[PDB]
Design a binder for this molecule. Structure first.
Ligand SMILES: O=C(c1ccco1)N1CCN(C(=O)C2CC2)CC1
Length: 171
């Protein structure tokens, strides 16, 4: 059976309990924690590409008020479709399953200024989603897993000083 497990789930849950934040910048900022998954039940012989996108979680934006995240108004129009191709793509099942798949180089941005970046709306909540695309498949089979532990609010600057401190502690 195909199984995609979140790595460092305990670390992600430490951030999620505070409400996770990821910085977005003009030039793009790498994530901490880094999304990493373990994979079993691929065809070791088949070739696959790994894609990453970010799904908008809510029909509203968020605001940090009195040390609490609360609904902060109507959402901006959805960020454009941005898919990140894992740089090991395409590769054998055996490649993806032999060691955890790390999305260490993906950059989150609030400006479409190129460079394979992911455009996100500040003060909106997103949930990372990984797609496994089988290569040379006339049916273009794709599997999609969501990672609820990895939900975060995109921010131009950290709102919660406990998040700022956590990011420094574990990174
Ligand atoms: O789908 C399965 C699974 C396990 C047994 C039968 O199916 N898993 C395990 C739980 N997962 C995690 O990411 C763990 C929290 C870290 C996702 C993958």
């Amino acid at each position: 059976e195909l199984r995609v497990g979140l790595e460092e789930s305990e670390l992600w849950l430490r951030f999620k309990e505070l409400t996770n934040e990821m910085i977005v910048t003009k030039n793009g900022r790498r994530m901490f924690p880094v999304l990493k998954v373990n994979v079993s039940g691929l065809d070791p012989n088949a070739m696959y590409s790994f894609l990453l996108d970010f799904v908008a979680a809510d029909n509203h934006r968020w605001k940090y008020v009195n040390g609490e995240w609360v609904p902060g108004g109507k959402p901006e129009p959805q960020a454009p479709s941005c898919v990140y191709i894992h740089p090991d793509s395409p590769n054998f099942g055996a490649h993806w399953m032999k060691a955890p798949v790390s999305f260490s180089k993906v950059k989150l941005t609030n400006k479409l200024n190129g460079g394979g970046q992911i455009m996100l709306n500040s003060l909106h909540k997103y949930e990372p989603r990984i797609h496994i695309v089988r290569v040379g498949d006339p049916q273009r089979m794709i599997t999609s897993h969501c990672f609820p532990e990895t939900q975060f609010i995109a921010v131009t600057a950290y709102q919660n000083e406990e998040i700022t401190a956590l990011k420094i502690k574990y990174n």
